[PDB]
PDB file of C-alpha atoms and ligand atoms in Angstrom:
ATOM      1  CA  UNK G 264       0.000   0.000   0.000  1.00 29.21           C
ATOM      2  CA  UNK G 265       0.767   3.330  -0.914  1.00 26.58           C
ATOM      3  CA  UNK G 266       1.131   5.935   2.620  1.00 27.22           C
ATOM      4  CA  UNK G 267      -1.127   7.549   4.392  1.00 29.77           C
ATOM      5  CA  UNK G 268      -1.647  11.262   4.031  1.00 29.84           C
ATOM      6  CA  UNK G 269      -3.444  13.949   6.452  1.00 28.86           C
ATOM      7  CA  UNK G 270      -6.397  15.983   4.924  1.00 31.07           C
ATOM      8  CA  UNK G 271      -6.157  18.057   1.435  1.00 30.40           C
ATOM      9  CA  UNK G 272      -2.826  15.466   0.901  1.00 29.99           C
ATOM     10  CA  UNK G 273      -1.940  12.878  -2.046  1.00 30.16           C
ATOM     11  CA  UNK G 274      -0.356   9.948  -1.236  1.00 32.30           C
ATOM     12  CA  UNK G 275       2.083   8.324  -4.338  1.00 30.27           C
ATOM     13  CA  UNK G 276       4.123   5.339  -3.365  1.00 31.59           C
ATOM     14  CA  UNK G 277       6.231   6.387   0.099  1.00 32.38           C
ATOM     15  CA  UNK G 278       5.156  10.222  -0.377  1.00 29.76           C
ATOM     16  CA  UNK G 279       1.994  12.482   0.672  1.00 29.53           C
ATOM     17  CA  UNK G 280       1.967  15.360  -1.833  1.00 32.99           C
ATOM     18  CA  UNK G 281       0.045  18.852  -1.886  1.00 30.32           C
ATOM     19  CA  UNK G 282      -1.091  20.654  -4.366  1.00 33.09           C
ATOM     20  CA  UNK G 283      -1.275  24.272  -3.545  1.00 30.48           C
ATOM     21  CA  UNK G 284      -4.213  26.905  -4.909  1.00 30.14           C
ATOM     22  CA  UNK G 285      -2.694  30.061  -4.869  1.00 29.50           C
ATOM     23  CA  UNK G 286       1.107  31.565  -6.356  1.00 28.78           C
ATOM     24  CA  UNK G 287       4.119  32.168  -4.385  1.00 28.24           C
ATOM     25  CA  UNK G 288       7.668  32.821  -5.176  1.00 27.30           C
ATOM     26  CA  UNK G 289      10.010  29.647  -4.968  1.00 27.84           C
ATOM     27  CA  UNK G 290      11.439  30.514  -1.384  1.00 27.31           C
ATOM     28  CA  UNK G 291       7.820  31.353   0.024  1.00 26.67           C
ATOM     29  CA  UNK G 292       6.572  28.404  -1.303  1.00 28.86           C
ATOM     30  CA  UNK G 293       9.006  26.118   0.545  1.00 27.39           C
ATOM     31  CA  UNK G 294       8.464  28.073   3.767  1.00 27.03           C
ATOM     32  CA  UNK G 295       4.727  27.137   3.509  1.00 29.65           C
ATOM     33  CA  UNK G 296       6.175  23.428   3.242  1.00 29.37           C
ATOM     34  CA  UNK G 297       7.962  23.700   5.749  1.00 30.43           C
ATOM     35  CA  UNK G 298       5.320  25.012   8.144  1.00 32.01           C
ATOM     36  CA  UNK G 299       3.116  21.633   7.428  1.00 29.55           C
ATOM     37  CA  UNK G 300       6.561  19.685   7.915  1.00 31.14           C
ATOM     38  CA  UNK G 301       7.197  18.958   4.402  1.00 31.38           C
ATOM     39  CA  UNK G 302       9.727  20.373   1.820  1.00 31.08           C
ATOM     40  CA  UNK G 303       9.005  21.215  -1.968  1.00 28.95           C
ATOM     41  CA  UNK G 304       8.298  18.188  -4.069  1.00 30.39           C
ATOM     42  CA  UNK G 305      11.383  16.172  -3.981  1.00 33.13           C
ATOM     43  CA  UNK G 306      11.163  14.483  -7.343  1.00 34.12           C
ATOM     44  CA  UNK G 307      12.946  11.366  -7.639  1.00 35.44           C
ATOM     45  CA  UNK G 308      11.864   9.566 -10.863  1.00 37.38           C
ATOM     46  CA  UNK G 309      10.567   9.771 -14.334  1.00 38.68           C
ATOM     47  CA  UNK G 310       6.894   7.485 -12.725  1.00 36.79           C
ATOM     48  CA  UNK G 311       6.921  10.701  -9.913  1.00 36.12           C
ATOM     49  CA  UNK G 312       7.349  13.282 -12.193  1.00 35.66           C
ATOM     50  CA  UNK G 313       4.434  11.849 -14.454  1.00 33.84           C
ATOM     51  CA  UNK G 314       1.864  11.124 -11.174  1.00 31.09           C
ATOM     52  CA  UNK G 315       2.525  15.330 -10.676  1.00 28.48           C
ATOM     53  CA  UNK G 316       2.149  15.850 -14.062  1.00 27.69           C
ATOM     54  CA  UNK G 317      -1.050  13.948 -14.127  1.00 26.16           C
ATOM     55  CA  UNK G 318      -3.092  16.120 -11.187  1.00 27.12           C
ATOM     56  CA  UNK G 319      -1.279  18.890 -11.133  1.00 27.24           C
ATOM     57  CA  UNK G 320      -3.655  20.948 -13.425  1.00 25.77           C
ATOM     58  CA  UNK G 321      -2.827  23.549 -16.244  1.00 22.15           C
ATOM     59  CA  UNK G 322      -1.047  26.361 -14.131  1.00 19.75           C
ATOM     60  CA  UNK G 323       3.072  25.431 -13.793  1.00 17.78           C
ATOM     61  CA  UNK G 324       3.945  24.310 -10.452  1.00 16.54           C
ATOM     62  CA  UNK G 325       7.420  24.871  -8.344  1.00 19.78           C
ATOM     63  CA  UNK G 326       9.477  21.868  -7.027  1.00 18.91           C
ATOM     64  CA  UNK G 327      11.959  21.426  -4.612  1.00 19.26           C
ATOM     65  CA  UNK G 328      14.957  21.527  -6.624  1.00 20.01           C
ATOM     66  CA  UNK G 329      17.633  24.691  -6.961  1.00 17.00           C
ATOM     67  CA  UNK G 330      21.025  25.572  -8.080  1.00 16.93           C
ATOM     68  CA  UNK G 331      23.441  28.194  -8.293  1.00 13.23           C
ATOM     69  CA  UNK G 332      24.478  29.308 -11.533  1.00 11.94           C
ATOM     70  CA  UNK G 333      27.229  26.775 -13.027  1.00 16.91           C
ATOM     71  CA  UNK G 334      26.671  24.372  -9.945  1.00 15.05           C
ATOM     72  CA  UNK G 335      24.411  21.961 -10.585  1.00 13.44           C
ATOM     73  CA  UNK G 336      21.033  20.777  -9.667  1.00 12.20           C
ATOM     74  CA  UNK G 337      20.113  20.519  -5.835  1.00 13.06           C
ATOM     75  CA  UNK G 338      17.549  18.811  -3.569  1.00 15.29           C
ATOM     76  CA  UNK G 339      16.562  21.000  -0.044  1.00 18.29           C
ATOM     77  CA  UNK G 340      18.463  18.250   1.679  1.00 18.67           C
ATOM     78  CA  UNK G 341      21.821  19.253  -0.196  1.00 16.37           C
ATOM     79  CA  UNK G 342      21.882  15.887  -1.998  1.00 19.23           C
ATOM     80  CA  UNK G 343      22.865  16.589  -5.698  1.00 17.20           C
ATOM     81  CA  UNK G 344      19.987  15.944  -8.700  1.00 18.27           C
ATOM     82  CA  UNK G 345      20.486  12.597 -10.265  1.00 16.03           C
ATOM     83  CA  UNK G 346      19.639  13.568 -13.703  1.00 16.67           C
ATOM     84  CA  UNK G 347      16.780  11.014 -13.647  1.00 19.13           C
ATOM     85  CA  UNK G 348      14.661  13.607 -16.571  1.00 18.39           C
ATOM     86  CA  UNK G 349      15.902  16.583 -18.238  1.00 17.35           C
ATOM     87  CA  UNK G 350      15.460  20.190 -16.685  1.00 15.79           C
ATOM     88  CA  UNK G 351      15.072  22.827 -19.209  1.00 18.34           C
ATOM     89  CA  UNK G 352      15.498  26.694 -19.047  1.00 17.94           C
ATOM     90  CA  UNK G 353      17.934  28.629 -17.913  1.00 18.25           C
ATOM     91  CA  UNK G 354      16.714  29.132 -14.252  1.00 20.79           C
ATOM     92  CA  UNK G 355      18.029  29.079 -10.678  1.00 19.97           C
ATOM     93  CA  UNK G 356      14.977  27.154  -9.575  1.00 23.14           C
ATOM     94  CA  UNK G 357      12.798  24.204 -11.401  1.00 22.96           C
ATOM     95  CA  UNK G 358       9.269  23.789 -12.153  1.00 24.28           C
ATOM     96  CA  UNK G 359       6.754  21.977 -14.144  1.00 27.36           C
ATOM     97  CA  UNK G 360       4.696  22.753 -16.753  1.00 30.73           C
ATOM     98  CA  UNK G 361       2.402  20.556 -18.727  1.00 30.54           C
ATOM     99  CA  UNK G 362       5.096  19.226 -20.639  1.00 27.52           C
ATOM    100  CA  UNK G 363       8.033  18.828 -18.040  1.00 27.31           C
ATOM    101  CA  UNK G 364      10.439  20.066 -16.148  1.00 29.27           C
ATOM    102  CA  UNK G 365      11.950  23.598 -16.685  1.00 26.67           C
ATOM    103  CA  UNK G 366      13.244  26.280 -14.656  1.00 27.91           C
ATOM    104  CA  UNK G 367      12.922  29.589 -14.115  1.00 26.64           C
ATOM    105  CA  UNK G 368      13.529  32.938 -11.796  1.00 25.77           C
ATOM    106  CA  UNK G 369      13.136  32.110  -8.242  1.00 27.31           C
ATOM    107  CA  UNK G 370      11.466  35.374  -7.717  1.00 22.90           C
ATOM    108  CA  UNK G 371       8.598  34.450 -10.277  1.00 23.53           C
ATOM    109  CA  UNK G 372       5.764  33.764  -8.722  1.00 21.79           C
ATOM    110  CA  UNK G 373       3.890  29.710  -8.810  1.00 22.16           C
ATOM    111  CA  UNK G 374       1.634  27.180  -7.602  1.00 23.29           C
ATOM    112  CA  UNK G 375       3.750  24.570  -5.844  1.00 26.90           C
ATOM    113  CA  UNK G 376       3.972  21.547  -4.764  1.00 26.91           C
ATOM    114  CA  UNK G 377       5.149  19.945  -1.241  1.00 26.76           C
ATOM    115  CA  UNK G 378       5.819  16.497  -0.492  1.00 27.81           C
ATOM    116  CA  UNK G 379       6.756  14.767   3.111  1.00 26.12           C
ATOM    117  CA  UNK G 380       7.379  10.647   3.997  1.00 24.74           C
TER     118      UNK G 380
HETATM  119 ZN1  LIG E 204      12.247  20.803   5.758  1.00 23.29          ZN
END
């Protein structure tokens, strides 16, 4: 069985996922993760990133992964992105559209999306 989230929560495989209404900016957004003791989505394969994809609706959504420019790709933990589906753009910090993955401005304002064990 797949876990067991609390109210307005997903659950996919080991993860509870939530899939915000309103826009924030990529920093604001993980600070309203972090206040239900979650993170931004850490997405960590291709069958993830398509269950997001799926309910995630038409608006783009942020994700929890960042990196300075010319370092590469980061989760919040630290842990470095294992290239597991391509990231386009030019941004600091990722998102997805209805397509993919892209990135983008971290000031730009999204939906998000947090996920917690
Ligand atoms: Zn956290």
């Amino acid at each position: 069985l797949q876990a067991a989230c609390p109210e307005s929560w997903i659950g996919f495989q080991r993860k509870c996922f939530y899939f915000s209404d309103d826009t924030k900016n990529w920093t604001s957004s993980q600070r309203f993760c972090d206040s239900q003791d979650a993170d931004l989505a850490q997405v960590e394969s291709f069958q993830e990133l398509n269950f997001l994809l799926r309910y995630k609706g038409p608006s783009d959504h942020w994700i929890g992964l960042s990196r300075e420019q010319g370092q590469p790709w980061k989760w919040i933990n630290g842990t470095e992105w294992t290239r597991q589906f391509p990231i386009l753009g030019a941004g600091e910090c990722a998102y997805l559209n209805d397509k993919g993955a892209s990135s983008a401005r971290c000031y730009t304002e999204r939906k998000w999306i947090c996920s917690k064990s």
